[PDB]
Amino acid sequence: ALAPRQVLDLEDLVFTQGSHFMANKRCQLPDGSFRRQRKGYEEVHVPALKPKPFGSEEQLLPVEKLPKYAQAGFEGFKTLNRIQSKLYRAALETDENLLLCAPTGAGKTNVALMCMLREIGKHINMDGTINVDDFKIIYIAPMRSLVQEMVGSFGKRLATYGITVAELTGDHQLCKEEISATQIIVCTPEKWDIITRKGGERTYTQLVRLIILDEIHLLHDDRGPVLEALVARAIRNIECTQEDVRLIGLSATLPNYEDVATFLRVDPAKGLFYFDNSFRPVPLEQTYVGITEKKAIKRFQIMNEIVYEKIMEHAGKNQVLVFVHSRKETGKTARAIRDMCLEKDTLGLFLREGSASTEVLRTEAEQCKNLELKDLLPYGFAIHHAGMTRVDRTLVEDLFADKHIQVLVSTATLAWGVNLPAHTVIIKGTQVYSPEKGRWTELGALDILQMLGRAGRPQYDTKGEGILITSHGELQYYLSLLNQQLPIESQMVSKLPDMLNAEIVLGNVQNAKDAVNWLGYAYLYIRMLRSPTLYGISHDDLKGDPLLDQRRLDLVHTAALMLDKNNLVKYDKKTGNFQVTELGRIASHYYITNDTVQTYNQLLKPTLSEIELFRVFSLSSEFKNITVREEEKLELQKLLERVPIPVKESIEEPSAKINVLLQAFISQLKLEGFALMADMVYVTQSAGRLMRAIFEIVLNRGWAQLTDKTLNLCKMIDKRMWQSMCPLRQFRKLPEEVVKKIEKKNFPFERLYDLNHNEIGELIRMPKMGKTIHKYVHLFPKLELSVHLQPITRSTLKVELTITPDFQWDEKVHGSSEAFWILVEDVDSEVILHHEYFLLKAKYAQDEHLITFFVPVFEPLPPQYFIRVVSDRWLSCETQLPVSFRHLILPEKYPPPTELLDLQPLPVSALRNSAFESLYQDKFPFFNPIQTQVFNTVYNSDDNVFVGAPTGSGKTICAEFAILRMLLQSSEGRCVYITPMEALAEQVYMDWYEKFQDRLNKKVVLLTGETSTDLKLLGKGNIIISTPEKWDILSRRWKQRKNVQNINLFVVDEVHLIGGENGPVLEVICSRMRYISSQIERPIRIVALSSSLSNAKDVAHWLGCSATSTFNFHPNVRPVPLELHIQGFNISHTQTRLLSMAKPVYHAITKHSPKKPVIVFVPSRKQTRLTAIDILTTCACDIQRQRFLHCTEKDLIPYLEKLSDSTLKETLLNGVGYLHEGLSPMERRLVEQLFSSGAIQVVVASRSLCWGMNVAAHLVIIMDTQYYNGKIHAYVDYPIYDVLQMVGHANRPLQDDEGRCVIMCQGSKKDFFKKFLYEPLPVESHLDHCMHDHFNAEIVTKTIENKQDAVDYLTWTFLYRRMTQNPNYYNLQGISHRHLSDHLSELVEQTLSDLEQSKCISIEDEMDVAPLNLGMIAAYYYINYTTIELFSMSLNAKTKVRGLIEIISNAAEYENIPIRHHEDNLLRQLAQKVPHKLNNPKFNDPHVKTNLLLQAHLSRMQLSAELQSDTEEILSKAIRLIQACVDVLSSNGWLSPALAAMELAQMVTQAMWSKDSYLKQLPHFTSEHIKRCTDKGVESVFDIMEMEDEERNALLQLTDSQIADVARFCNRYPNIELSYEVVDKDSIRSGGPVVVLVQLEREEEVTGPVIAPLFPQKREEGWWVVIGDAKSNSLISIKRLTLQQKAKVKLDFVAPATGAHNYTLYFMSDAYMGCDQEYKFSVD
């Protein structure tokens, strides 16, 4: 939106007077106003307004009839106040926004409490749990001491509900260790503005339903813009999130109050309330006088004789306090009476309650003497201020509320601190010293009203008394303030650039027009409309622009020019768009002005000296008005010589006073002159934020030297000490004299670790507390650093810093966490090459943490690096560790990518077969340049080819070109297509099913879990799809399964996935094929579909690919040109970083893909809904509703009717769907189909779904790059290939002209993606860390016969080709061939030696090896060798059913069952629900998780999401693990544990327990249904079919249309007809063998699968024919054969001596339970 703009001078439109700028011309005096005069001061009185009788419409309303849920807290308050009674219905029965205008004395504390109780009254739970802390309340009080009043008052009056009210404010870093358990937050406007000032600090605002703006007439003060920024930001978020927050405004009666109502969106008919001074709690009789001229020395005198005769009205009935300004002036004016009133006349000769200066009874008794209270003690005089006895100043207040002290002398802090009123307030010359200007300007208006509001004590008085004294010229201002005639105005023109740059950083505004609308949400907009002539506007330019579209534009334009001048925000004149700079981000987050940032940027240098750092601080524009007075030259010089840092900036003047005041505050130098005490506080409270901003500015720029200086100065200000001092000063409970004595001699602090508590006393001449010093030395935080280095390229290294804590934890000392800064720098410690914020939580304190980051290197490789880990809070808490490269062997250079020639795109006409052109012509005519170049090799040849192109480059059909080659030279060819992901396996299978079996009539199959049906699917299959694990178990027995070698084509997609998790299983089978291709029959064509690989020559040479048949392309030759945009979020807290991205995610869609489809990848599945709804609310927030829905809602109602997720049905109506694993396949296919159709423009998918998605888009936004890992209690980055596949979804060659991906990640990971995505991806192997199972299986299959065969096996692996080029990655100390054979021999020796003591193999000679019993069962079931070793270790002769349940759950195959967020206590609930709870469960162990998942699966408990997608993974590997226990228990000779193990596979498929009911296989039978047949009913599945009378649904009925399913599992449920055969003549008297034969044929000729309603895998019926002893726990024979109709019962055994032996034939199953029967017999 372009429009001509004009520059404005803000100084002309600003209210220069600030808080005391009165807009009214005159001042209406009341009726009883008389003006009496003296010769130095003239009096102007106003009377005490009479009390108004209650009208007929309003009456007092007690607390009895208000609702019972909120009557608590009002205990002790019988009847509501007259104001509360008028708002009893508004503040408790309506959620309308309120604005209370009342006299300052009205209290207003109960009305704010009634609005809280209404918010609290929404979550009751019928007194079962009042603590439903889903809500939060904010109370914004203007002054600091007011906050201490509300926290205590609301504390006692709300603790009855379990509510916890706290207060976060001051100079801390927004501590979240005690906020999530808080419900009412009390803080200042600037503090709550600091909250919402950060990027993702919305956690508080998302739960807040109520905010209260107490003393909201602060809008008139210079702090007014802070309140405007709060409300304007909060209301816009109410619109941008569609969640309503109720605003309550509390104000003193002043003009323009209705404008404050419109500012808060208050309905003047149901929310606005105004009560003039007629509603004062006590009618105050005010006086107003003004000094004429001075007589400056007599000014202090003239103003004092007017204080005495005001005490003369009533002796004791006149209770007084004298308000001053200075802390010690509580004595000066209290000595003025002691000097003036003493020597002139009667110095308050008080003499009533007794005989020696009134009551001294309770005066001399309660006697503490706080070094000031005494000279005014035998009478009612007392002092109060923030100066001294801050601990026992409450005693000055305690002995006063009981009517004990009659005159006080206090400061403005008390009026806000504790509500202690009096009969007569008083004040003095209202001209305070303001360090912001260094002047003595008029007192702030907000103080004066709160000051005189203490004129009352309604519980102990009936009349007030006014009492002010000031000048005359420009002093009728105070008449208009205290008499409801001081108009509330807007000071936003003052702080406009600071409030604008705020919203720019939040993203709430993006350009000039975005900000002009933001200006309409503030109080400045309304005030510019009602009184436009006051705000520099005229009446003629108002008619042409009543909305002020030009003035607000001119205001935004000028403020934007200042932010550009100071480099806060880059902003152009033409488009008017805003761009946030790093300086603007820090200026906002740390609340520093735009002028200060420019000075910081103008001066900060990498080599900036420490003395200049204090200079750069002292030039902060927050101190631009701090000057120096003559009364300060003496004390300032007596500080400069006492402070350490040599101040070379100036001998004095202004910049050095700020510098000296810093070091004086750091060194805790006690000051005397009060002109410096008030100035030092101002240059130190901001010193925390100012120096912390300089720290982040320097840290993010990588200036290692100044980063250490600025970070130290941040701790030096916080800890109020220097680095030269002893670090033990930070322990604030050690005697300073002792700590000052340990630093007498220059004894190093680290040497204290090596000294006991006795040697401590030896060197400190004080063995008194030598033991309590050894306590705090070991309480100091100390970290240990160990590093493992791994080179990736010749320019990057993979550092694995292992942090080990070495100290004792203490929440009293450290708290709930300890922060650190992992800084890695170069040799000279000048450049921070990488940095990240490491946190050390309390509950995981002594646990070991491993941080994985990457660092760059260069060809002139320096000898070392340095990983310095310093603390973020503690001074001198640093652990350093060099990283020497003296043994570093950088990898080999990667060859350039294969050049892409601009060949004329070959059409489908080049493909000869017209039966194939029909599968490629109706889609696109010409192949892309990457395809047209590899065509001739992959199709017109029979050699091995390797294609390397980025994901999403049409590379999938290149594998199909090799498939067409096989079909032309084979009838029913044999092709095995391998894909590392199961989701991508089904994604290509169905894609290839149509293109080869539907239209080409060539059977295309997909492998499964059971190897029996896998072998027959291998036979029928012409195009075979398989994951590495399914093809490994089949191709392992390749010697026998000869249909594995006869394959003609062997495709492997995404072979760069060899270096990731589950990678070695892909390397083993790809080398398994390269080896069984040694001229056995014919080359098996090893086409390996890969991506951009730097070391692609190693993958080609591995798979026999030549150089001509190796096409590896750079990522930039992508067919659809990609525009990658990586932006960083410097937020270490992951839960906050995600919420800080929900706004840039929407702002990225509107910029990169406004009308084209967009995919967003979020880490968790709960974020799929949140990010979708956030896009919804932020979309309608832009007044752009339904711009992502490109169809009409009527066209979606039929489709959305079949959806069950109510939220998906609502978000899709707004054109934004989402995809997560919690959705049904029908729901996922629907959202993917509607997205590719263009109906919806946005899908928000999980990370886990980035593979199984047949969907592309124009813009792919990656929300986060980290997912939670509950096993280590830390967040880990995305696997690089997960990110790669996500970026690939930004590929639409037919539609889009370009691809666009936006990666949003933590700033610590930005430099990682900044080069591993623009460059080819280097790949390495991981076979050494997963070698035993493939070696153990190679020996059982007799492929490895000796140790030399194991060395020969490694010659075919990808590990062989990479160990020579990147040595240090696999810890190869040398590069020569001498080290290659040594490391290989050491590798095969250590791998076989592990199988030796694991009983898997048997080493006999230095060469030969042989498999054993444990080794064969581990290779048969594809079970890890440690699992069957654990089985042989734990299985004894008494393992029952529950004993087996615990053992199988501990299998190594269940190690990768993930532990996710908020499951540490979610799994704790299942332990109290399962019938067999475990002892010592930590709930963060996957084996403890898997044990509870099947214990709930056994009890048929619902799966409750999340922990349900892992249960299906358990049941996949569940069958093979139980059958292993059957073999181990049979090998050991135990029948009772073996029979219980055979029952386990039964109770898993149908989900039963040990003593469960047998009818639990019925398709519709609840848990309370077996009780229908317990008296004389059915108990088995046989008497329901033996009952030839087809009764069926005649004893009890539930469903008639679904009894067609019970009839299916009925005749599949097999009956038994068994009769063992033993002869007495073929064997007798033991000795020889004994042979037994069992039956084979059964009734129903069944050809139906096993019913698996709860088992996610189709199964086959398997039965164990076991012959064991009667009850001697001796399993004699056992055979596991598949169930059919005819087999050969091969079982035999040797008989024991004598002859009388009772045997038993067991015929157990593995699918159902009930058909098992026993047969007892005896032979011999």
Side-chain angles (χ1 to χ4, degrees), residues 10 492-501 518-519 555-556 559:
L10 267 57
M492 181 135 268
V493 199
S494 322
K495 299 191 57 181
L496 190 72
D498 280 350
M499 297 309 178
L500 185 90
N501 171 74
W518 161 77
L519 215 49
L555 256 64
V556 166

Side-chain angles (χ1 to χ4, degrees), residues 19 21-22 24 99-104 108 215-221 250-261 272-277 445-446 449 477-489 523:
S19 176
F21 169 79
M22 54 187 297
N24 59 322
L99 178 66
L100 241 183
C101 300
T104 167
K108 214 160 302 173
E215 308 281 311
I216 208 188
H217 54 285
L218 181 73
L219 263 53
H220 200 6
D221 199 327
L250 310 182
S251 175
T253 42
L254 287 179
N256 300 339
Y257 68 95
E258 49 262 64
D259 289 354
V260 183
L272 181 61
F273 298 99
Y274 188 98
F275 299 126
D276 58 335
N277 264 35
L446 178 53
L449 262 174
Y477 165 93
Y478 291 65
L479 316 178
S480 42
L481 174 58
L482 300 152
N483 289 319
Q484 314 117 285
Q485 298 182 44
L486 181 137
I488 300 172
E489 296 299 334
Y523 190 63

Side-chain angles (χ1 to χ4, degrees), residues 904-1197:
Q904 189 263 358
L906 266 299
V908 198
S909 53
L911 164 54
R912 190 263 162 265
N913 201 324
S914 289
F916 298 158
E917 305 169 19
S918 59
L919 306 185
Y920 287 83
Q921 168 247 332
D922 290 317
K923 278 66 55 186
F924 72 130
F926 305 150
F927 304 95
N928 44 79
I930 290 184
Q931 285 167 357
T932 66
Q933 188 175 341
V934 80
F935 186 177
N936 187 25
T937 305
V938 67
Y939 196 18
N940 281 332
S941 72
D942 278 312
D943 57 348
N944 326 124
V945 71
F946 165 91
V947 190
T951 172
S953 297
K955 71 291 185 201
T956 308
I957 73 171
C958 290
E960 305 172 338
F961 275 67
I963 291 185
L964 308 185
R965 174 74 168 204
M966 186 194 69
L967 265 56
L968 262 61
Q969 292 141 350
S970 183
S971 56
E972 31 265 30
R974 315 292 285 181
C975 162
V976 186
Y977 169 81
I978 304 299
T979 279
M981 286 308 183
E982 178 67 64
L984 288 184
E986 313 158 345
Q987 183 167 309
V988 183
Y989 161 73
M990 271 181 167
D991 196 304
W992 279 356
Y993 196 103
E994 168 178 346
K995 307 174 64 177
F996 293 112
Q997 188 165 349
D998 278 355
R999 215 55 270 153
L1000 266 40
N1001 286 72
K1002 223 64 64 64
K1003 286 195 172 186
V1004 173
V1005 303
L1006 170 68
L1007 288 204
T1008 165
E1010 290 186 358
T1011 53
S1012 65
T1013 66
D1014 263 318
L1015 282 169
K1016 77 186 210 307
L1017 290 180
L1018 163 66
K1020 287 201 183 187
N1022 311 132
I1023 307 301
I1024 308 165
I1025 322 297
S1026 174
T1027 71
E1029 186 157 326
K1030 296 177 303 185
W1031 184 240
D1032 196 14
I1033 189 60
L1034 291 189
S1035 57
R1036 267 180 179 179
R1037 303 278 182 167
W1038 66 271
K1039 203 60 183 60
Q1040 302 172 355
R1041 300 160 174 174
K1042 308 214 79 63
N1043 41 14
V1044 180
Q1045 303 84 298
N1046 75 333
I1047 68 172
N1048 325 123
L1049 170 56
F1050 179 73
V1051 199
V1052 187
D1053 204 337
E1054 310 280 83
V1055 314
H1056 55 279
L1057 305 192
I1058 178 187
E1061 184 197 32
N1062 306 334
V1065 293
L1066 186 64
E1067 186 176 342
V1068 167
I1069 62 176
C1070 286
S1071 297
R1072 178 97 44 73
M1073 297 299 138
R1074 265 286 285 178
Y1075 170 63
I1076 68 176
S1077 182
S1078 56
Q1079 278 187 108
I1080 319 294
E1081 280 86 51
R1082 219 58 259 154
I1084 44 182
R1085 256 223 170 193
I1086 179 160
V1087 284
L1089 243 184
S1090 185
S1091 55
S1092 177
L1093 258 47
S1094 64
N1095 54 316
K1097 54 176 294 297
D1098 303 318
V1099 194
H1101 176 232
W1102 174 35
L1103 309 185
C1105 297
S1106 59
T1108 165
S1109 63
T1110 298
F1111 290 90
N1112 182 83
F1113 302 98
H1114 203 262
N1116 51 19
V1117 306
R1118 194 165 173 262
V1120 178
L1122 174 63
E1123 301 172 354
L1124 186 58
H1125 285 130
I1126 308 175
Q1127 76 183 81
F1129 283 75
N1130 302 34
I1131 294 181
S1132 176
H1133 198 275
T1134 308
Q1135 307 169 260
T1136 292
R1137 192 180 353 118
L1138 291 172
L1139 298 179
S1140 65
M1141 291 163 168
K1143 208 67 55 55
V1145 156
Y1146 175 82
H1147 294 313
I1149 296 180
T1150 60
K1151 183 173 184 176
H1152 288 321
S1153 177
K1155 296 196 170 188
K1156 304 209 175 189
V1158 167
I1159 296 179
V1160 172
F1161 286 108
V1162 297
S1164 51
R1165 75 145 273 264
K1166 282 296 185 177
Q1167 197 69 19
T1168 50
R1169 309 172 186 264
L1170 300 190
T1171 303
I1173 298 178
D1174 272 328
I1175 291 178
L1176 259 64
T1177 64
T1178 324
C1179 190
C1181 193
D1182 204 3
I1183 324 178
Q1184 286 271 317
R1185 194 171 189 265
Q1186 277 188 348
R1187 54 165 280 182
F1188 293 146
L1189 182 66
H1190 295 286
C1191 64
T1192 64
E1193 302 193 23
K1194 251 304 174 69
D1195 305 12
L1196 298 184
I1197 301 167

Side-chain angles (χ1 to χ4, degrees), residues 489-755:
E489 296 299 334
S490 184
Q491 323 283 351
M492 181 135 268
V493 199
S494 322
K495 299 191 57 181
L496 190 72
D498 280 350
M499 297 309 178
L500 185 90
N501 171 74
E503 308 294 344
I504 301 181
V505 166
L506 283 105
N508 292 19
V509 300
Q510 301 191 104
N511 49 48
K513 197 173 187 179
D514 267 291
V516 177
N517 298 129
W518 161 77
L519 215 49
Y521 288 62
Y523 190 63
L524 181 76
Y525 179 50
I526 306 167
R527 294 301 310 117
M528 280 185 303
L529 299 181
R530 311 303 180 87
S531 299
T533 179
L534 175 60
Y535 287 82
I537 327 177
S538 68
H539 292 205
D540 42 318
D541 52 349
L542 177 65
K543 64 170 294 297
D545 190 12
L547 302 181
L548 267 42
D549 271 320
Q550 161 78 343
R551 176 58 76 87
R552 305 202 315 271
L553 210 179
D554 285 329
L555 256 64
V556 166
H557 178 67
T558 304
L561 293 162
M562 304 172 181
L563 309 181
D564 198 317
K565 200 180 79 69
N566 301 147
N567 293 28
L568 271 202
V569 159
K570 293 188 60 180
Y571 148 80
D572 69 304
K573 168 71 177 65
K574 189 61 179 180
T575 78
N577 201 273
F578 291 147
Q579 291 190 22
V580 187
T581 73
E582 182 52 44
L583 266 43
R585 214 121 51 209
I586 302 188
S588 185
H589 298 341
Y590 291 100
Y591 211 154
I592 82 181
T593 186
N594 50 273
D595 300 303
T596 289
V597 152
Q598 176 51 42
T599 292
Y600 288 178
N601 189 25
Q602 205 164 262
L603 304 181
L604 284 173
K605 304 155 53 184
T607 75
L608 176 124
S609 61
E610 218 272 6
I611 54 181
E612 279 168 310
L613 180 59
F614 281 91
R615 170 161 172 269
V616 174
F617 171 90
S618 63
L619 299 186
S620 296
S621 294
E622 294 77 355
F623 313 134
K624 76 192 304 178
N625 286 121
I626 283 291
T627 55
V628 54
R629 304 113 202 99
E630 298 300 319
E631 333 297 323
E632 324 182 308
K633 274 73 161 175
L634 190 273
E635 192 170 9
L636 282 171
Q637 175 55 38
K638 269 59 206 172
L639 296 174
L640 168 61
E641 200 175 349
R642 293 188 56 189
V643 295
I645 295 309
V647 180
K648 310 243 190 257
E649 313 107 41
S650 56
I651 39 63
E652 256 327 302
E653 237 183 337
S655 172
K657 176 187 176 182
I658 315 152
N659 189 317
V660 171
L661 258 49
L662 243 185
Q663 322 180 31
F665 174 82
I666 300 180
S667 313
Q668 301 206 17
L669 263 44
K670 168 83 173 188
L671 264 44
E672 202 62 45
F674 302 90
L676 265 41
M677 186 65 248
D679 260 4
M680 184 176 57
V681 168
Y682 174 80
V683 298
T684 51
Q685 289 178 334
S686 301
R689 311 186 318 274
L690 282 174
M691 194 54 53
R692 208 72 194 191
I694 305 175
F695 165 60
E696 301 271 352
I697 286 184
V698 169
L699 169 61
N700 219 83
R701 289 180 181 180
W703 301 345
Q705 289 289 359
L706 191 49
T707 304
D708 206 18
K709 307 174 191 300
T710 50
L711 180 60
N712 268 5
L713 189 43
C714 289
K715 315 164 180 178
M716 288 197 292
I717 295 176
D718 170 67
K719 286 301 185 298
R720 295 205 63 176
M721 49 172 293
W722 296 85
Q723 189 181 358
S724 64
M725 296 178 178
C726 173
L728 292 182
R729 291 172 179 255
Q730 306 178 98
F731 300 113
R732 304 190 295 184
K733 287 188 177 179
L734 282 183
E736 57 277 342
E737 303 291 325
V738 184
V739 184
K740 195 178 180 180
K741 196 180 296 184
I742 68 188
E743 58 188 349
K744 279 280 221 304
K745 57 179 180 179
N746 296 279
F747 191 75
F749 176 82
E750 188 162 351
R751 206 177 294 169
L752 278 74
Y753 286 110
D754 300 315
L755 298 182

Side-chain angles (χ1 to χ4, degrees), residues 62-126:
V63 306
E64 265 184 325
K65 84 292 168 191
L66 72 92
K68 185 58 180 59
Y69 67 81
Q71 297 206 25
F74 274 171
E75 182 202 346
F77 281 70
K78 185 175 182 178
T79 310
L80 285 175
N81 192 16
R82 45 183 171 181
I83 290 182
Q84 282 88 291
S85 299
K86 200 169 180 181
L87 311 192
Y88 142 81
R89 262 173 284 268
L92 262 178
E93 311 186 19
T94 49
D95 273 49
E96 213 78 17
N97 280 18
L98 308 174
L99 178 66
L100 241 183
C101 300
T104 167
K108 214 160 302 173
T109 318
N110 285 252
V111 186
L113 195 78
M114 283 187 291
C115 302
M116 300 171 181
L117 294 178
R118 174 159 182 80
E119 184 48 61
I120 301 180
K122 301 184 178 183
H123 331 89
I124 312 177
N125 199 18
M126 297 205 69

